[PDB]
Amino acid sequence: YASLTEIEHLVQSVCKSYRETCQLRLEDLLRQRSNIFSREEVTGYQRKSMWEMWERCAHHLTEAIQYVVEFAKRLSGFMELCQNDQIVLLKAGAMEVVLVRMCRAYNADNRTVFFEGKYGGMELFRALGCSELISSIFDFSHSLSALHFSEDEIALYTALVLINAHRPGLQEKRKVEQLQYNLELAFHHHLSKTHRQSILAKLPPKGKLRSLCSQHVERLQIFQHLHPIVVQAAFPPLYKELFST
Protein backbone atom coordinates (compact mmCIF):
# COMPACT_ATOMS: atom_id res chain seq x y z
CA TYR A 1 0.00 0.00 0.00
CA ALA A 2 1.89 3.02 -1.31
CA SER A 3 1.40 6.19 0.74
CA LEU A 4 0.62 9.52 -0.95
CA THR A 5 4.28 10.49 -0.59
CA GLU A 6 5.43 7.17 -2.10
CA ILE A 7 2.96 7.74 -4.97
CA GLU A 8 4.19 11.32 -5.35
CA HIS A 9 7.82 10.26 -5.64
CA LEU A 10 6.86 7.53 -8.10
CA VAL A 11 5.39 10.31 -10.24
CA GLN A 12 8.71 12.11 -9.84
CA SER A 13 10.92 9.20 -10.88
CA VAL A 14 8.74 8.41 -13.95
CA CYS A 15 8.65 12.01 -15.25
CA LYS A 16 12.40 12.35 -14.71
CA SER A 17 13.17 9.04 -16.45
CA TYR A 18 11.11 10.22 -19.41
CA ARG A 19 12.77 13.69 -19.52
CA GLU A 20 16.19 12.03 -19.69
CA THR A 21 15.22 9.53 -22.42
CA CYS A 22 12.74 11.37 -24.62
CA GLN A 23 15.10 11.24 -27.65
CA LEU A 24 14.03 14.48 -29.27
CA ARG A 25 13.09 17.58 -27.29
CA LEU A 26 9.52 18.61 -28.12
CA GLU A 27 10.59 22.08 -29.23
CA ASP A 28 13.00 20.63 -31.79
CA LEU A 29 10.06 18.64 -33.22
CA LEU A 30 7.76 21.69 -33.34
CA ARG A 31 10.49 23.90 -34.89
CA GLN A 32 10.86 21.42 -37.77
CA ARG A 33 7.12 21.44 -38.63
CA SER A 34 7.81 24.04 -41.33
CA ASN A 35 10.34 21.71 -43.01
CA ILE A 36 8.19 19.56 -45.33
CA PHE A 37 9.18 17.07 -48.03
CA SER A 38 8.59 18.57 -51.52
CA ARG A 39 6.86 16.87 -54.49
CA GLU A 40 10.13 15.58 -56.00
CA GLU A 41 11.35 14.37 -52.58
CA VAL A 42 8.07 12.49 -51.90
CA THR A 43 8.28 10.90 -55.39
CA GLY A 44 11.92 9.96 -54.66
CA TYR A 45 10.76 8.13 -51.54
CA GLN A 46 7.89 6.42 -53.33
CA ARG A 47 10.29 5.17 -55.97
CA LYS A 48 12.70 3.52 -53.50
CA SER A 49 12.91 -0.21 -53.35
CA MET A 50 10.97 -1.94 -50.61
CA TRP A 51 14.20 -3.37 -49.22
CA GLU A 52 15.74 0.09 -48.84
CA MET A 53 12.65 1.73 -47.29
CA TRP A 54 12.27 -1.13 -44.75
CA GLU A 55 15.98 -0.99 -43.89
CA ARG A 56 15.84 2.77 -43.26
CA CYS A 57 12.73 2.32 -41.10
CA ALA A 58 14.28 -0.57 -39.17
CA HIS A 59 17.20 1.69 -38.22
CA HIS A 60 14.98 4.62 -37.16
CA LEU A 61 12.77 2.31 -35.03
CA THR A 62 15.81 0.69 -33.48
CA GLU A 63 17.10 4.13 -32.50
CA ALA A 64 13.69 5.00 -30.91
CA ILE A 65 13.68 1.60 -29.13
CA GLN A 66 17.14 2.23 -27.64
CA TYR A 67 15.67 5.29 -25.89
CA VAL A 68 12.70 3.21 -24.60
CA VAL A 69 15.07 0.56 -23.20
CA GLU A 70 16.84 3.38 -21.35
CA PHE A 71 13.47 4.78 -20.12
CA ALA A 72 12.63 1.33 -18.66
CA LYS A 73 16.12 0.90 -17.14
CA ARG A 74 15.61 4.15 -15.23
CA LEU A 75 12.02 3.33 -14.32
CA SER A 76 11.47 2.94 -10.59
CA GLY A 77 10.12 -0.54 -10.08
CA PHE A 78 11.05 -1.96 -13.50
CA MET A 79 14.57 -3.02 -12.53
CA GLU A 80 13.13 -4.55 -9.37
CA LEU A 81 11.20 -7.08 -11.53
CA CYS A 82 12.84 -10.41 -12.46
CA GLN A 83 15.06 -10.61 -15.57
CA ASN A 84 12.55 -12.71 -17.50
CA ASP A 85 9.71 -10.31 -16.77
CA GLN A 86 11.84 -7.30 -17.81
CA ILE A 87 12.46 -9.04 -21.20
CA VAL A 88 8.80 -10.02 -21.53
CA LEU A 89 7.52 -6.45 -20.97
CA LEU A 90 10.14 -4.83 -23.22
CA LYS A 91 9.60 -7.33 -26.06
CA ALA A 92 5.85 -6.71 -25.98
CA GLY A 93 5.89 -3.03 -25.10
CA ALA A 94 8.94 -1.27 -26.59
CA MET A 95 7.20 -0.69 -29.95
CA GLU A 96 3.94 0.33 -28.24
CA VAL A 97 5.80 3.02 -26.26
CA VAL A 98 7.53 4.29 -29.44
CA LEU A 99 4.21 4.59 -31.25
CA VAL A 100 2.80 6.62 -28.35
CA ARG A 101 5.92 8.82 -28.21
CA MET A 102 5.66 9.44 -31.95
CA CYS A 103 2.39 11.43 -31.65
CA ARG A 104 4.76 14.23 -30.52
CA ALA A 105 6.18 14.12 -34.06
CA TYR A 106 2.75 14.10 -35.75
CA ASN A 107 1.47 17.43 -37.08
CA ALA A 108 -2.35 17.24 -37.05
CA ASP A 109 -2.72 20.50 -39.03
CA ASN A 110 -1.25 19.14 -42.29
CA ARG A 111 -1.39 15.42 -41.33
CA THR A 112 2.36 14.74 -41.53
CA VAL A 113 5.03 12.98 -39.49
CA PHE A 114 8.65 13.91 -38.77
CA PHE A 115 10.76 11.41 -40.75
CA GLU A 116 14.40 11.63 -41.83
CA GLY A 117 14.73 15.32 -41.06
CA LYS A 118 11.48 16.67 -42.55
CA TYR A 119 7.69 16.27 -42.28
CA GLY A 120 5.77 14.09 -44.74
CA GLY A 121 2.33 12.56 -45.24
CA MET A 122 1.51 8.85 -45.24
CA GLU A 123 2.09 8.49 -48.99
CA LEU A 124 5.83 9.13 -48.40
CA PHE A 125 5.79 5.57 -47.10
CA ARG A 126 4.30 3.76 -50.11
CA ALA A 127 7.52 1.83 -50.97
CA LEU A 128 7.04 -0.13 -47.75
CA GLY A 129 3.99 -1.90 -49.25
CA CYS A 130 1.85 -1.77 -46.08
CA SER A 131 -0.31 1.29 -46.73
CA GLU A 132 -3.10 -0.07 -44.50
CA LEU A 133 -0.73 -0.30 -41.52
CA ILE A 134 0.74 3.15 -42.28
CA SER A 135 -2.66 4.80 -42.64
CA SER A 136 -3.68 3.11 -39.34
CA ILE A 137 -0.64 4.64 -37.61
CA PHE A 138 -1.44 8.09 -39.02
CA ASP A 139 -5.04 7.71 -37.72
CA PHE A 140 -3.72 6.58 -34.33
CA SER A 141 -1.31 9.51 -34.02
CA HIS A 142 -4.11 11.81 -35.16
CA SER A 143 -6.34 10.48 -32.36
CA LEU A 144 -3.61 10.89 -29.71
CA SER A 145 -2.78 14.49 -30.66
CA ALA A 146 -6.36 15.54 -29.86
CA LEU A 147 -5.72 14.66 -26.19
CA HIS A 148 -2.93 17.31 -26.06
CA PHE A 149 -0.74 15.24 -23.76
CA SER A 150 1.84 17.18 -21.84
CA GLU A 151 5.30 15.63 -21.62
CA ASP A 152 4.57 14.51 -18.02
CA GLU A 153 1.40 12.76 -19.21
CA ILE A 154 3.36 10.97 -21.95
CA ALA A 155 5.86 9.91 -19.28
CA LEU A 156 3.08 8.55 -17.08
CA TYR A 157 1.03 7.00 -19.89
CA THR A 158 4.07 5.29 -21.46
CA ALA A 159 5.10 3.89 -18.10
CA LEU A 160 1.67 2.24 -18.00
CA VAL A 161 1.88 1.06 -21.62
CA LEU A 162 5.10 -0.67 -20.60
CA ILE A 163 4.06 -1.98 -17.15
CA ASN A 164 1.15 -4.14 -18.27
CA ALA A 165 0.36 -7.17 -16.14
CA HIS A 166 -1.58 -8.82 -19.01
CA ARG A 167 1.46 -9.88 -21.09
CA PRO A 168 1.82 -13.66 -21.58
CA GLY A 169 4.95 -15.38 -20.24
CA LEU A 170 5.48 -13.56 -16.93
CA GLN A 171 7.18 -15.51 -14.15
CA GLU A 172 5.93 -13.10 -11.44
CA LYS A 173 2.58 -11.84 -12.57
CA ARG A 174 1.67 -10.50 -9.07
CA LYS A 175 4.76 -8.25 -8.75
CA VAL A 176 3.88 -6.64 -12.09
CA GLU A 177 0.26 -6.22 -10.95
CA GLN A 178 1.41 -4.28 -7.90
CA LEU A 179 3.73 -1.97 -9.89
CA GLN A 180 1.05 -1.37 -12.50
CA TYR A 181 -1.49 -0.26 -9.85
CA ASN A 182 1.00 2.05 -8.16
CA LEU A 183 1.62 3.54 -11.61
CA GLU A 184 -2.14 3.87 -12.25
CA LEU A 185 -2.38 5.61 -8.86
CA ALA A 186 0.59 7.80 -9.89
CA PHE A 187 -1.09 8.71 -13.22
CA HIS A 188 -4.41 9.49 -11.53
CA HIS A 189 -2.71 11.48 -8.79
CA HIS A 190 -0.89 13.62 -11.40
CA LEU A 191 -4.02 14.12 -13.52
CA SER A 192 -5.98 15.30 -10.43
CA LYS A 193 -3.55 18.18 -9.64
CA THR A 194 -3.58 19.51 -13.21
CA HIS A 195 -7.36 18.86 -13.28
CA ARG A 196 -6.80 16.68 -16.36
CA GLN A 197 -8.72 13.49 -15.53
CA SER A 198 -11.15 13.98 -18.45
CA ILE A 199 -8.54 12.63 -20.90
CA LEU A 200 -8.93 9.17 -19.32
CA ALA A 201 -12.21 8.47 -21.20
CA LYS A 202 -10.58 9.65 -24.41
CA LEU A 203 -7.55 7.31 -24.08
CA PRO A 204 -7.10 4.68 -26.85
CA PRO A 205 -9.13 1.49 -26.39
CA LYS A 206 -7.26 -1.34 -24.70
CA GLY A 207 -6.01 -3.61 -27.49
CA LYS A 208 -5.57 -0.88 -30.12
CA LEU A 209 -1.82 -0.44 -29.46
CA ARG A 210 -1.24 -4.20 -29.26
CA SER A 211 -3.15 -4.47 -32.56
CA LEU A 212 -0.91 -1.96 -34.38
CA CYS A 213 2.17 -3.74 -33.10
CA SER A 214 0.75 -7.08 -34.19
CA GLN A 215 0.16 -5.76 -37.73
CA HIS A 216 3.75 -4.45 -37.82
CA VAL A 217 5.27 -7.83 -36.83
CA GLU A 218 3.06 -9.44 -39.50
CA ARG A 219 4.14 -7.01 -42.28
CA LEU A 220 7.79 -7.78 -41.33
CA GLN A 221 6.99 -11.44 -41.79
CA ILE A 222 5.85 -10.72 -45.36
CA PHE A 223 8.93 -8.57 -46.02
CA GLN A 224 11.42 -11.06 -44.54
CA HIS A 225 10.12 -13.82 -46.80
CA LEU A 226 10.71 -11.51 -49.78
CA HIS A 227 14.18 -10.33 -48.65
CA PRO A 228 15.66 -12.72 -46.04
CA ILE A 229 19.28 -11.77 -46.84
CA VAL A 230 18.69 -7.99 -46.41
CA VAL A 231 17.17 -8.59 -42.95
CA GLN A 232 20.04 -10.88 -42.01
CA ALA A 233 22.82 -8.64 -43.41
CA ALA A 234 21.55 -5.11 -42.85
CA PHE A 235 18.84 -4.99 -40.13
CA PRO A 236 19.86 -4.03 -36.58
CA PRO A 237 20.27 -7.17 -34.47
CA LEU A 238 18.05 -5.59 -31.76
CA TYR A 239 15.20 -5.01 -34.23
CA LYS A 240 15.61 -8.65 -35.34
CA GLU A 241 15.52 -9.90 -31.73
CA LEU A 242 12.37 -7.88 -31.02
CA PHE A 243 10.24 -8.28 -34.16
CA SER A 244 11.63 -11.28 -36.08
CA THR A 245 10.61 -14.92 -35.39
Binding site: Q66, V69, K73, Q83, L90, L238, E241, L242
Partner: peptide
Protein backbone atom coordinates in the same frame (compact mmCIF):
# COMPACT_ATOMS: atom_id res chain seq x y z
CA UNK B 1 20.52 -11.90 -25.84
CA UNK B 2 20.70 -8.21 -26.78
CA UNK B 3 17.88 -7.11 -24.47
CA UNK B 4 19.76 -8.89 -21.68
CA UNK B 5 22.95 -7.05 -22.66
CA UNK B 6 21.21 -3.69 -22.95
CA UNK B 7 19.71 -4.35 -19.52
CA UNK B 8 22.83 -5.68 -17.72
Amino acid sequence: TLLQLLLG
